[PDB]
Amino acid sequence: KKGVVHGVATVAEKTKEQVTNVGGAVVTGVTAVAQKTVEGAGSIAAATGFVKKDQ
Amino acid sequence: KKGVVHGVATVAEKTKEQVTNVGGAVVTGVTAVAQKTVEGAGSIAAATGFVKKDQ
Amino acid sequence: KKGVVHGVATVAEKTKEQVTNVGGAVVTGVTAVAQKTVEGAGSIAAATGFVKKDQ
Amino acid sequence: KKGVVHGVATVAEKTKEQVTNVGGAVVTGVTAVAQKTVEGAGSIAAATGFVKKDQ
Amino acid sequence: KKGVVHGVATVAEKTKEQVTNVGGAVVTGVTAVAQKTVEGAGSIAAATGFVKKDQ
Amino acid sequence: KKGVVHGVATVAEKTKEQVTNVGGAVVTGVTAVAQKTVEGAGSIAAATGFVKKDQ
C-alpha cells in the first residue's frame, strides 16, 4: 500500500473509534458532573478537556 | 491500495465511529451535568470539551 | 482501491456513525443538564462542546 | 420551651429545608440522568432514592 | 427545655437541613448519572440510596 | 434540660444537617456516576448506599 498526506490525517483499518480535530473540540466520552456550590472569581471547577489563550 | 490527501482526512475501514472537525465543535458522547449553585464572576464550572481565545 | 481528496473528507466502510464539520457545531450525543441557580457575570456553567473567539 | 409528639415530627428553628415523609417519596434535590442504551431483563440502571418490596 | 416523643422525631435549632422518613425515600442531594450501555439480567448499575426486600 | 424518647430520635442544637430514617432511604450528598459498559448477570456495579434482603 501507499499513503501520501499533507496533514492532518488519520489512517487506519479495523479501528473502533477515530477523531481528527483541527480547532476546536470534540467530546465523545462519557462524562458526569455533579456539583453543589461554586464560588470565587474566577475558579475553573472541573474541566476535562480544556485549553485557554490570550493575546 | 493508495491514498492521497491534502487534509484533513479520516480514512478507515470497519470503524464504529469517526469524527472529522475543522472548526468548531462536535459532541457525540453521553454527558450529564447536575448542578445546584454557581456564583462568582466569572467561573467556568464544569466544561468537558472547551477552548478559548482572545485577540 | 484509491482515494483522492482535498479535504475535508471522512471515508470509511461498515461504520456506525460519522460526522464531518466545517464550522460550526454538530450535536449527536445524549446530554442532560439539570440546574438550580446560576449567577455571576459572567460564568460559563456547564459547557460540553464549546469554542470561543474574539478579535 | 416544651414539645410533645406522637410521631412523626420535625421540629426546628431557623432551618433552611425540612422534609417529613410517611409513605412515600419526596424529591427535592437536583438530579440529571443522561443515558444511551439500557437492556437486560430486568436491570435497575441508575436509581437514587429507591425502595422495593414483595409479599 | 423539655421534649417528649414517641418516635420518630427530629428536634433541633439553627439547623440548615432536616429529613425525617418513615417509608420510603427522600432525595435531597445533587446527583448526576451519565451512562452508555447497560446489559445483563439483571444488574443494578449505579444505585445511590437503595434498599431491597422479598418475602 | 430533659429529654424522653421511645425512638427513634435525633436531638441536637446548632446542627447543620440531620437525617432520621426508619425505612427506607435518604440521599442528601453529592453523587456522580459516569459509566460506559455494564454486563454480566447480575453485577452491582457502583452502589453507594445499599442494602439487600431475601426471605
UniProtKB/Swiss-Prot annotation, chains A, B, C, D, E, F:
Quaternary assembly: Soluble monomer. Homotetramer. A dynamic intracellular population of tetramers and monomers coexists normally and the tetramer plays an essential role in maintaining homeostasis. Interacts with UCHL1. Interacts with phospholipase D and histones. Interacts (via N-terminus) with synphilin-1/SNCAIP; this interaction promotes formation of SNCA inclusions in the cytoplasm. Interacts with CALM1. Interacts with STXBP1; this interaction controls SNCA self-replicating aggregation. Interacts with SNARE components VAMP2 and SNAP25; these interactions allows SNARE complex assembly and integrity.
Organism listed in the record: Homo sapiens (Human)
Domain-related comment: The 'non A-beta component of Alzheimer disease amyloid plaque' domain (NAC domain) is involved in fibrils formation. The middle hydrophobic region forms the core of the filaments. The C-terminus may regulate aggregation and determine the diameter of the filaments.
Superkingdom assignment: Eukaryota
Identification of the protein by name: Alpha-synuclein
Tissues with expression: Highly expressed in presynaptic terminals in the central nervous system. Expressed principally in brain.
Residues of the whole record sequence present: 45 to 99 of 140
Sequence repeats: 1-12, 13-23
Name of the gene: SNCA
Family per similarity comment: Belongs to the synuclein family.
Phosphoserine PTM positions: 43
